[PDB]
Amino acid sequence: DLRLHLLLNTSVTCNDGSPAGYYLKESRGSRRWLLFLEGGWYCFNRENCDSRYDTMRRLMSSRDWPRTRTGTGILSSQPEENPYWWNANMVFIPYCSSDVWSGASSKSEKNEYAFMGALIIQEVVRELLGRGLSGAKVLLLAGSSAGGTGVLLNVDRVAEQLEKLGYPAIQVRGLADSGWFLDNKQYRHTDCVDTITCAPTEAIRRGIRYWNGVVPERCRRQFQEGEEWNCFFGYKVYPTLRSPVFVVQWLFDEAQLTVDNVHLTGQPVQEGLRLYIQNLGRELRHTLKDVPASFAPACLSHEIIIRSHWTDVQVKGTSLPRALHCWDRSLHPLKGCPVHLVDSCPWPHCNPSCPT
Numbered sequence: 107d108l109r110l111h112l113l114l115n116t117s118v119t120c121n122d123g124s125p126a127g128y129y130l131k132e133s134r135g136s137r138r139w140l141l142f143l144e145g146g147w148y149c150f151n152r153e154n155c156d157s158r159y160d161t162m163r164r165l166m167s168s169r170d171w172p173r174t175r176t177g178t179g180i181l182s183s184q185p186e187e188n189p190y191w192w193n194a195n196m197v198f199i200p201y202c203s204s205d206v207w208s209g210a211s212s213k214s215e216k217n218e219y220a221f222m223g224a225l226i227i228q229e230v231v232r233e234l235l236g237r238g239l240s241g242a243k244v245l246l247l248a249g250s251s252a253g254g255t256g257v258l259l260n261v262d263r264v265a266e267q268l269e270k271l272g273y274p275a276i277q278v279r280g281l282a283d284s285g286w287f288l289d290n291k292q293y294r295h296t297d298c299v300d301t302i303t304c305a306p307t308e309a310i311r312r313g314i315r316y317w318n319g320v321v322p323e324r325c326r327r328q329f330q331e332g333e334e335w336n337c338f339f340g341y342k343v344y345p346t347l348r349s350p351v352f353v354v355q356w357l358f359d360e361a362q363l364t365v366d367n368v369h370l371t372g373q374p375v376q377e378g379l380r381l382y383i384q385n386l387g388r389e390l391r392h393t394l395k396d397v398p399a400s401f402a403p404a405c406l407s408h409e410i411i412i413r414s415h416w417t418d419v420q421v422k423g424t425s426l427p428r429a430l431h432c433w434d435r436s437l438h439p440l441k442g443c444p445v446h447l448v449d450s451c452p453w454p455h456c457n458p459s460c461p462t
């Protein structure tokens with residue numbers, strides 16, 4: 107189990123002003139540290155965050171968090187469940203900022219909610235240095251869904267934080283799971299009123315300014331003010347990072363289809379929707395051609411790395427834990443140890459190892 111620690115700096119808060127925190131399981135015989143960023147969509151205005159506070163309060167507050175949490179998947183310490191990093195120090199950072207880990211504004215008389223996702227990561231890394239992170243050999247910043255996008259938004263800031271604090275030996279790396287989205291056109295137009303069924307562009311646009319969200323520096327200088335929403339999309343922000351980032355992304359992510367307003371009921375799919383789905387898989391495949399460390403199975407699913415059966419899926423005969431191990435080896439063309447694994451078949455579940 108991972109033990110809950112609320113941030114000693116109580117000025118770094120969740121949405122409702124309650125303190126943020128992190129779950130920790132130390133491994134005294136390891137110099138490898140895995141910091142996982144939880145996901146769970148976001149909210150971009152006062153009245154939509156108010157609704158999130160009624161029925162998703164744990165994603166906005168720490169007042170009801172449990173004292174412990176079970177490490178699953180890549181956060182598991184059993185080698186059977188986690189062949190990759192079972193012996194590493196495990197850190198689970200709950201997502202309680204609703205800002206895709208980008209905000210850096212505190213709750214005041216002008217803000218009903220605090221959006222401090224970017225400062226939460228910074229404060230956790232800071233406070234972990236006194237509990238063993240100072241002697242770390244690799245810091246892997248991982249995350250799923252919104253936490254996956256958060257890795258892309260924060261991995262260079264964490265690396266910049268550690269050098270400026272005098273820890274050049276800590277190799278900061280990123281693992282972004284199911285956070286690689288396309289700002290494509292929906293299959294059927296909808297009215298952007300919520301977070302689930304809104305155009306992925308315009309939702310980020312209003313959120314980033316509601317949050318006062320921050321984006322990585324080189325990406326900010328390319329797109330410049332008013333266009334920082336572009337850096338929330340993997341294929342635009344990834345080329346600007348220097349830190350190594352392994353990208354895990356279903357070719358047919360359920361969250362991607364949701365914001366695209368695609369709903370597979372079970373009826374025979376018409377030509378229009380069939381071409382739309384095949385074109386989506388092709389577009390994602392294209393955005394990953396120049397991503398050397400990637401794992402993209404042709405499945406309709408959502409998230410993977412913290413699921414207990416994340417070992418089952420395979421691309422071209424190689425599992426994700428193996429590809430991540432090969433990635434570790436590449437960072438010390440490997441024989442029989444591939445690191446770029448992207449399916450080429452064009453329909454959901456054409457890979458037989460897809461989750462059922």
Ligand SMILES: CNC(=O)c1cc2c(s1)-c1ccccc1CC2
Pocket residue numbers: 145146147148206250251252253255287306310338339361362365
């Ligand atoms: C549990 N589902 C999530 O957490 C997220 C879903 C999406 C996210 S996060 C997203 C992130 C950046 C840009 C655009 C989007 C739209 C879809």
Ligand SMILES: *[C@@H]1O[C@H](CO)[C@@H](O)[C@H](O)[C@H]1NC(C)=O
Pocket residue numbers: 115117118225229
């Ligand atoms: C707490 O975090 C805030 C935001 O990063 C910072 O301004 C403040 O100095 C921190 N306080 C301490 C004691 O670290």
